[PDB]
C-alpha cells in the first residue's frame, strides 16, 4: 500500500535508442511555495504610471503553479543531442508519460528571529491537467521555469497568471476571469502519487539537414535550354543604336537568365547590425529602426519573425536586428548584458531556399516605358506568398522550445511556430499544482469574514517525464564525408557541458540540428 | 486503506448541463473552532436590561456547529446562473450528495506570550445528520455562515443555538432543552470520511419568467361583449336630471367596465419610501410606521411579507418600507449603512398579476344609498383570499435562499416561503459537527467534579455538496427578441464578479430569474 513510510516512485533518467525510435526519460526534484498568500489578484499596467501605450495590459495572478518541460535540454543530454543530429534527417514526438511522486509538505513557523521547519503529514497538494483546453495557455511563450538541463539541480515551480483584453489599464465587458478551483482536481497526501498519458497528433518531421543545392542552381550545367529570353532591346553598332528585339537561349554561361520553375519564400525585411560596433551608425536605433507589426493601436516587434537567412556568404558579422534567437550565457545579466555574455544563433543554412533577412526580395516594374519615357523599377521589401514559393522553417536548438499551441481561429497560413518547433492544435496539456491552504486557529466567536490567517507551507517532490520520439533515417548516396557536430580536441581549463570548480553547470554554445545534407 | 498518509477525497467543483438536467458540485475549505469551551449555556434577553418586550427571548447556545448551503451562489457561478435564467422557464431541486473529508485536528498551546500550533493525530470530530427532524430547525432564517460564493475562500463554521418558549426572560413549563450528545454520531480521525445522500420531495417549479399580459387586459380588443353593465343612473339633459337606469355593452373603448373572470391576488399594505430623500417626510418612521403583525403581545415586522409589486410604472424611486429583500455590498457596515452600501431588489415583474405594495387593493361600498342618502365607498388596505384570485410568488436571487422548512401545523395556506424559494415538509437535514474534548492532565487524587480543563483545539477539512436540478424548457412562439441578462459592454476599472487588486471577491448587483416571458 501507500503510506508514510513507503516511497511512491523511483528515479528514472535514461535514453533508449531502438531502431527508428528513441525514448527519453527525465526526473527532477522540485520545490513549490505558496503564491500570493493563497489569493487571486487583479494586475494591470497603464500609461498613468508612465508606461507607453505599447506595453499596457490587464490580467490576473493566481495562487497556483505549473509544470513546464518545453525545452529540448529537458529531455536530451548533450551527447544524446549529438547522436540525434549527426545521424538523422528528421524526428517528431509521438507520446508522453508524466508522473508526480514522493511528496513532502513542510510547515515553517516564525518566532522572534529564529525560523524552524517541520513536517506536516496530513497536508495536501492539488493537481489537475487542463485536458479540454479551457484555460488561457501560457506555455509556448519561452518563459523561464522549465525543468533544468542538468539532472542534479533542484528547481522552483513558476507562478501561473494570464492576461485578457484591456483598454489602457482598464478591462472591458469581454474580459474573462477564471477561478482554477472551479475545476476537478486530485488531492494528494505524502503517500499519494499522480500520473497521466498523452498522445501527440500527426505532425510533420522537423527537417534536420541543410540543402546541398540552391534553388537557382537546379539546372544541368552542360546543356542549353530550348526556351528563349529577350536579350537585347537596342542595336550594338558603330553610331546609330536604334531599337531592336533580339533573343537568346539560356545556357551554361547565363544561368541568371534561364527559365525556372520555382521562387524563393517570403520576405519581411529586417535592419542589419554588425558585431563590429565601429561599423554601426552612432545612434540608439534598436526600437526606432525595429521591424514591427501593428495591432489595435499597439506596436509590437516581429521577433524573430518569419524564417530568413541570417546573412549571406562571408557576412557572418551581420545579423538582423530583431530577427534571431539569442540565448544567455550562465550568469548573464537580465538587463543591458554585453555582447560577450550572450549567444547568437544563425539560420545561415536556409540561405539556399530563403531570402536573406537584411536584403530586398527583388525588383519589379514601376511604370510603362515608351519611346518618350525610360523604364523605372522598384524594390520589394516585403513579399507575401506567391504560387511557386518554397521555404524552410527555422531550426530548433537544444536550449530552445519544442511545441506551441496553434491559436483557434478561422484561418491560418503554414502554422509552424515562429520561434521554432512543432505547431499543435491539441498540445500537451498544462499541469497545475497548488498547496492547499491550512488555517491558523480561528476565533471562538463566529465571524463571517473569510479566513485569511494561515500556516506557512511549501512542498517538494519528484517529477518524471517520458517522451517517445520517431526518427527519420538518412538515406544519402553522397560520396564525400559530411559535416558533423563535434567537441574540440584541444586542451582547456574546463570541459564543455560540465560543472566547474564551484559546481555550476553551463552550456557553452547553442547547438542546432542541421549537419547532414540532402538534395533540393 | 485510510491512514495518516493518504487522502480521503478529491476536489470537485463543476457543472454539467445534460438535456433537461443540470448538476452542480462545489467544494470548499472550512475551519472549525471549539465553541463555549465545550459547554451548553442558557441565554436570554428581557426587559430588565432595557430591551423592549418585542425583543425578549429564552434559549440555549451549544458547543456544536453546523453546515449550511442554502444560498444559490453556493451552487452556481455567475455564468451558470446566466445560462439558467436566460434559457429556462423553471427549475427545481431533485437530489443531493454531501461529503466531508481530509480532516486535520490541530492543538494550540499558550506559553508566555508565544503561541504554537501542532498536529494531533489521534483526536476526533463528531458528525451527525438529524434525519428525523428532532431538533429545532434553524436553517431557513437567512443567517450568515453559508459556504462562500467564491471557491477559493476559506470559511468559518457557525455556532448552533436555538430558542424555545419564553415569558419575558424567564422560561415556562413547556420549554424544551436539547442535548446534542444524546444522538448517535460518527467519530472521525484524520483518515476517516463522512457522506450521505438525500432526495427532494415533489415541489412545483420556480417560475422564472414574467407575464407578457396583464390580468385586466386578457380580452380581444376588436370585439364587443354580449353582456351589459350599468352605465348611467341619471338623465343627461337640459335641466331636470332625474333618476334613470341605462345599460351598455363592454367594448374596446371601455375595458375598465368589462366583465372579467379573475381577480388580483392578496394585499397587505406597506408604507412607501423614496430613494430621493428630500421627498420623504422629515421624521424617523421606520419602526413607528412599519407594517407589523401581532403575536402573543409581541409586535413583529412583516418582513418582506406577501409578494407584491414593488412600484407601478415609472415609479422606480419608491419601495415598500419593510417589503423587499435588501442585500449588502462588500464591506458594508453592520449598522446604519448608507443607501450607497446596499442593493435593493425589485419585484416589478409581478405587477401584471399582483397589487402594488404601496396602494389599496380596491374600493367597496360602505352604506345603502337611497333617495335621501348619497352613496359612500371605502378603501381596502388588506384583503385575504377571494375565490378567483391568481398571483405570483416572490422571485429568487443568486445571493438569496433556496428552501425553507414548512412548519408542522394543522393548516397552512399556499406554503411558499415569503423570503423566496421552495417550501419543503422534509427539507435537507441539518448537519452538526463538533470537536471532541480532550482533557488536560487530571489530578492524581480522585475528585468528582467534572473535568473542565482542556487542550485547545480546532479542525479543518474539505466539504463537497452536489445537487441535481430539473429544468423546464421554454416553448415560446414569440416573434421578437427577449430581454436577457447581460454584462455591460463598456470599459471599467474592474471586472464584475471577479477579484480586485487586493484579492477580494465581490458581487456587484443582485440577479433575479425573470427574463423570458410567457402568456398569462
Amino acid at each position, epitope marked *: 500500500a501507500d503510506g508514510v513510510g513507503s516511497s511512491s516512485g523511483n528515479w528514472h533518467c535514461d535514453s533508449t535508442w531502438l531502431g527508428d525510435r528513441v525514448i527519453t526519460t527525465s526526473t527532477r526534484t522540485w520545490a513549490l511555495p505558496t503564491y500570493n498568500n493563497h489569493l487571486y489578484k487583479q494586475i494591470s499596467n497603464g500609461t498613468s504610471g508612465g508606461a507607453t501605450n505599447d506595453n499596457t495590459y490587464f490580467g490576473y495572478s493566481t495562487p497556483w503553479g505549473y509544470f513546464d518541460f518545453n525545452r529540448f535540454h529537458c529531455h536530451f543530454s548533450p551527447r544524446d543531442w549529438q547522436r540525434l543530429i549527426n545521424n538523422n534527417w528528421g524526428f517528431r514526438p509521438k507520446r508522453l508519460s508524466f508522473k508526480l511522486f514522493n511528496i513532502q509538505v513542510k510547515e515553517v513557523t*516564525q518566532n522572534e528571529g529564529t525560523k524552524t521547519i517541520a513536517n506536516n503529514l496530513t497536508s495536501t497538494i492539488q493537481v489537475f491537467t487542463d485536458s479540454e483546453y479551457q484555460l488561457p495557455y501560457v506555455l509556448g511563450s519561452a518563459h523561464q521555469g522549465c525543468l533544468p538541463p542538468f539532472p542534479a539541480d533542484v528547481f522552483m515551480i513558476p507562478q501561473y497568471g494570464y492576461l485578457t483584453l484591456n483598454n489602457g489599464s482598464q478591462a472591458v465587458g469581454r474580459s474573462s476571469f477564471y477561478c482554477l478551483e472551479y475545476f476537478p482536481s486530485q488531492m494528494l497526501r505524502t503517500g499519494n502519487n499522480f500520473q497521466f498519458t498523452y498522445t501527440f497528433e500527426d505532425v510533420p518531421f522537423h527537417s534536420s539537414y541543410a540543402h546541398s543545392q540552391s534553388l537557382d542552381r537546379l539546372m544541368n550545367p552542360l546543356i542549353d535550354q530550348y526556351l528563349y529570353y529577350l536579350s537585347r532591346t537596342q542595336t550594338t553598332g558603330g553610331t546609330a543604336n536604334t531599337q531592336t528585339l533580339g533573343f537568346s537561349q539560356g545556357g551554361p554561361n547565363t544561368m541568371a537568365n534561364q527559365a525556372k520553375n520555382w521562387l524563393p519564400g517570403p520576405c519581411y525585411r529586417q535592419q542589419r547590425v554588425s558585431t563590429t560596433t565601429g561599423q554601426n551608425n552612432n545612434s540608439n536605433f534598436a526600437w526606432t529602426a525595429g521591424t514591427k507589426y501593428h495591432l489595435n493601436g499597439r506596436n509590437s516587434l516581429a521577433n524573430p519573425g518569419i524564417a530568413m537567412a541570417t546573412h549571406k556568404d562571408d557576412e557572418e558579422r551581420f545579423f538582423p536586428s530583431n530577427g534571431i534567437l539569442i540565448f544567455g550565457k550562465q550568469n548573464a545579466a537580465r538587463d543591458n548584458a554585453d555582447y560577450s555574455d550572450v549567444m547568437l544563433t544563425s539560420e545561415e543554412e536556409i540561405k539556399t531556399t530563403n531570402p536573406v533577412a537584411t536584403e530586398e526580395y527583388g525588383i519589379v516594374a514601376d511604370n510603362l516605358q515608351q519611346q518618350n519615357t525610360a523604364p523605372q523599377i522598384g524594390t520589394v521589401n516585403s513579399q507575401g506568398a506567391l504560387p511557386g514559393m518554397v521555404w524552410q522553417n527555422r531550426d530548433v536548438y537544444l536550449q530552445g522550445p519544442i511545441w506551441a499551441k496553434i491559436p483557434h481561429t478561422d484561418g491560418n497560413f503554414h502554422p509552424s511556430p515562429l520561434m521554432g518547433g512543432f505547431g499543435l492544435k491539441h498540445p500537451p496539456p498544462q499541469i497545475l499544482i497548488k498547496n492547499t491552504p491550512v488555517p491558523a486557529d480561528p476565533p471562538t466567536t463566529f465571524n463571517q469574514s473569510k479566513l485569511n490567517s*494561515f500556516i506557512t507551507q511549501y512542498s517538494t517532490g519528484q517529477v518524471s517525464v517520458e517522451i517517445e520520439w520517431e526518427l527519420q533515417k538518412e538515406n544519402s548516396k553522397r560520396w564525400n564525408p559530411e559535416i558533423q557536430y563535434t567537441s574540440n580536441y584541444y586542451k582547456s581549463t574546463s570541459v564543455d557541458f560540465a560543472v566547474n570548480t564551484e559546481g555550476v553547470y553551463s552550456e557553452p554554445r547553442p547547438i542546432g540540428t542541421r549537419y547532414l545534407t540532402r538534395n533540393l | 486503506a485510510d491512514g495518516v498518509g493518504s487522502s480521503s477525497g478529491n476536489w470537485h467543483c463543476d457543472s454539467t448541463w445534460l438535456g433537461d438536467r443540470v448538476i452542480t458540485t462545489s467544494t470548499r475549505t472550512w475551519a472549525l473552532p471549539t465553541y463555549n469551551n465545550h459547554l451548553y449555556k442558557q441565554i436570554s434577553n428581557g426587559t430588565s436590561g432595557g430591551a423592549t418586550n418585542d425583543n425578549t427571548y429564552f434559549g440555549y447556545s451549544t458547543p456544536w456547529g453546523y453546515f449550511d448551503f442554502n444560498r444559490f451562489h453556493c451552487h452556481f457561478s455567475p455564468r451558470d446562473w446566466q445560462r439558467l435564467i436566460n434559457n429556462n422557464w423553471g427549475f427545481r431541486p431533485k437530489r443531493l450528495s454531501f461529503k466531508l473529508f481530509n480532516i486535520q485536528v490541530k492543538e494550540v498551546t499558550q506559553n508566555e506570550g508565544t503561541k504554537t500550533i501542532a498536529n494531533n493525530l489521534t483526536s476526533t470530530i463528531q458528525v451527525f445528520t438529524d434525519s428525523e427532524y428532532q431538533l429545532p430547525y434553524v436553517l431557513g432564517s437567512a443567517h450568515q455562515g453559508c459556504l462562500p460564493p467564491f471557491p477559493a475562500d476559506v470559511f468559518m463554521i457557525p455556532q448552533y443555538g436555538y430558542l424555545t418558549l419564553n415569558n419575558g426572560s424567564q422560561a415556562v413549563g413547556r420549554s424544551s432543552f436539547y442535548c446534542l450528545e444524546y444522538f448517535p454520531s460518527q467519530m472521525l480521525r484524520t483518515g476517516n470520511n463522512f457522506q450521505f445522500t438525500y432526495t427532494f420531495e415533489d415541489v412545483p417549479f420556480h417560475s422564472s419568467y414574467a407575464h407578457s399580459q396583464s390580468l385586466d387586459r386578457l380580452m380581444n380588443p376588436l370585439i364587443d361583449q354580449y353582456l351589459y353593465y350599468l352605465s348611467r343612473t341619471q338623465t343627461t339633459g337640459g335641466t331636470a336630471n332625474t333618476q334613470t337606469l341605462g345599460f351598455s355593452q363592454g367594448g374596446p373603448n371601455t375595458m375598465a367596465n368589462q366583465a372579467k373572470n379573475w381577480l388580483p391576488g392578496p394585499c397587505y399594505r406597506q408604507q412607501r419610501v423614496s430613494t430621493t430623500t428630500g421627498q420623504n417626510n422629515n421624521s424617523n418612521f421606520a419602526w413607528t410606521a412599519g407594517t407589523k403583525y401581532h403575536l402573543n403581545g409581541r409586535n413583529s415586522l412583516a418582513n418582506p411579507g406577501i409578494a407584491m409589486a414593488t412600484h407601478k410604472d415609472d415609479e422606480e424611486r419608491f419601495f415598500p418600507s419593510n417589503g423587499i429583500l435588501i442585500f449588502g455590498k*462588500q464591506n458594508a457596515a453592520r449598522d446604519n449603512a448608507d443607501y450607497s452600501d446596499v442593493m435593493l431588489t425589485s419585484e416589478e415583474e409581478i405587477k401584471t398579476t399582483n397589487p402594488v405594495a404601496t396602494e389599496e387593493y380596491g374600493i367597496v361600498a360602505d352604506n345603502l344609498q337611497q333617495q335621501n342618502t348619497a352613496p359612500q365607498i371605502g378603501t381596502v388596505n388588506s384583503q385575504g383570499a377571494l375565490p378567483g384570485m391568481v398571483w405570483q410568488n416572490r422571485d429568487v436571487y443568486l445571493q438569496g435562499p433556496i428552501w425553507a422548512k414548512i412548519p408542522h401545523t394543522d393548516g397552512n395556506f399556499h406554503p411558499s416561503p415569503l423570503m423566496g424559494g421552495f417550501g419543503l415538509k422534509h427539507p435537507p437535514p441539518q448537519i452538526l459537527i463538533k470537536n471532541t474534548p480532550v482533557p488536560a492532565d487530571p489530578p492524581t487524587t480522585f475528585n468528582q467534579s467534572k473535568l473542565n480543563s482542556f487542550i485547545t483545539q480546532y479542525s479543518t477539512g474539505q466539504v463537497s455538496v452536489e445537487i441535481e436540478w430539473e429544468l423546464q424548457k421554454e416553448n415560446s412562439k414569440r416573434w421578437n427578441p427577449e430581454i436577457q441578462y447581460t454584462s455591460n459592454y463598456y470599459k471599467s476599472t474592474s471586472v464584475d464578479f471577479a477579484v480586485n487588486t487586493e484579492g477580494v471577491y465581490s458581487e456587484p448587483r443582485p440577479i433575479g430569474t425573470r427574463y423570458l416571458t410567457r402568456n398569462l
Partner: nanobody, 125 residues
Framework: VQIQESGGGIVQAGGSLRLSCAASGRTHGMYAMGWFRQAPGKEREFVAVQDITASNTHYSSAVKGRFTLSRDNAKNTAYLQMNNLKPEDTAVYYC???????????????????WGQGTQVTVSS
C-alpha cells in the same frame, strides 16, 4: 486607502506613549494591521502585527514585554501602546496594513500593501 499616523511625540525614559493609526474604506481589506520602525540611518524593522479577529498576534523580540497592540474594527483603527521606553526606541514608526497574515512571513515588509507617512518618537534619559 490612506493610513494615517498620530500620537507622535518626545518622552522621557520610562514613560508610557501611545501611537495610533486610522484607515478609510475597504473593511474587506485592512485584514492585518501592524507597525514597523526605521531608526536614524538604519534598516526598517517590524514591530508588531495583529489580525482582524484578534486571534493571531506577534511581537518583535525587542518589542515584546513592553508594547501591546490593540485594534478597533468599528472605528477601523489600530492602536499601539508603549511602556518602559528606552532611547534606542527612537525611530520613525509606520503603520502598515495588508490583506493576509502568514505564520512564516509576517515579519517581512514584502507582505504589507499600505504604508503611512510615519511618526517620529524621541526618547531621552
Amino acid at each position: 486607502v490612506q493610513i494615517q499616523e498620530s500620537g507622535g511625540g518626545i518622552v522621557q525614559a520610562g514613560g508610557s506613549l501611545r501611537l495610533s493609526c486610522a484607515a478609510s474604506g475597504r473593511t474587506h481589506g485592512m485584514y492585518a494591521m501592524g507597525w514597523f520602525r526605521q531608526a536614524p540611518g538604519k534598516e526598517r524593522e517590524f514591530v508588531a502585527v495583529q489580525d482582524i479577529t484578534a486571534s493571531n498576534t506577534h511581537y518583535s523580540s525587542a518589542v515584546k514585554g513592553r508594547f501591546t497592540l490593540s485594534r478597533d474594527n468599528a472605528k477601523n483603527t489600530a492602536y499601539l501602546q508603549m511602556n518602559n521606553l528606552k532611547p534606542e526606541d527612537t525611530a520613525v514608526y509606520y503603520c502598515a496594513a495588508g490583506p493576509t497574515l502568514m505564520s512564516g512571513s509576517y515579519n517581512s515588509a514584502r507582505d504589507y500593501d499600505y504604508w503611512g507617512q510615519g511618526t517620529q518618537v524621541t526618547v531621552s534619559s
